[PDB]
Amino acid sequence: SMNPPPPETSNPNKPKRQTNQLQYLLRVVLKTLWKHQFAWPFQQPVDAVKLNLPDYYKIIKTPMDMGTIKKRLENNYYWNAQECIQDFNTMFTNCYIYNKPGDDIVLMAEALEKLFLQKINELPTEE
Ligand SMILES: CCn1c2c(c(=O)[nH]c1=O)[C@H]1C(=C(C)N2)C(=O)OCc2ccccc2OCCCOc2ccccc21
Structure with a gap:
């Protein structure tokens, strides 16, 4: 598989x-981004087969996505x-x-990242 x-x-x-x-x-942080209208490309590992991206994993050698993050947090x-x-x-x-x-996907990521940073700005001090 690709x-x-x-x-x-x-x-x-x-x-x-x-x-x-x-x-x-x-x-x-995760919940806010997960429910955003632009979350869907980021809710699971990039599927190079479904998406016809045979170069994706030639370029991206450290993949990460919010489905993985969500499960890591839950676990x-x-x-x-x-x-x-x-x-x-x-x-x-x-x-x-x-x-x-x-690109459209970049515009989506940029909107999610702005919101990510707004939520990170309020991250509580550890205690
Ligand atoms: C986050 C991973 N990702 C990604 C994309 C992308 O272009 N670059 C990425 O890095 C793809 C993509 C996902 C899930 N994810 C996707 O649903 O495409 C659909 C697709 C499937 C089959 C043939 C052509 C298709 O769409 C043509 C338009 C260009 O594609 C876009 C456009 C807007 C948003 C996302 C994307």
């Missing part, structure tokens, strides 16, 4: 913690908020690497 195995959403050897910040990342996979924030940033960075400025 598609690689998707990123793991569990791993018994991965170290993990729960924190108030990770809780906010699920309850606020308490992360050690800290930074790991989760990094996954969101990988997703956006991949979109801007693969697609051209001004």
Whole structure:
């Protein structure tokens, strides 16, 4: 298949913690983006077969998507908020690497990223 195995959403050897910040990342940040009208291209791994993107995984070697992030949060996979924030940033960075400025998918990502950053601005201090 053109598609690689998707990123793991569990791993018994991965170290993990729960924190108030990770809780906010699920309850606020992920939920807000997940329900947005532009979420759908980002709700699951990029499917190069369905989407006719035979070059996608020649270019994008660190794939990430919000379906994976959602499951990682639900599974308490992360050690800290930074790991989760990094996954969101990988997703956006991949979109801007693969697609051209001004493309519809880029306009969608930019709207989601603006909202992401508005929610991150209110991330509680860890306690
Ligand atoms: C986030 C991953 N992604 C992605 C896309 C893309 O172009 N670049 C990406 O990085 C595709 C895409 C997804 C899910 N995802 C998608 O549903 O296409 C549909 C499609 C399937 C079969 C043939 C041609 C098709 O559409 C032609 C228009 C150009 O495609 C667009 C346009 C707007 C939004 C998304 C996309």
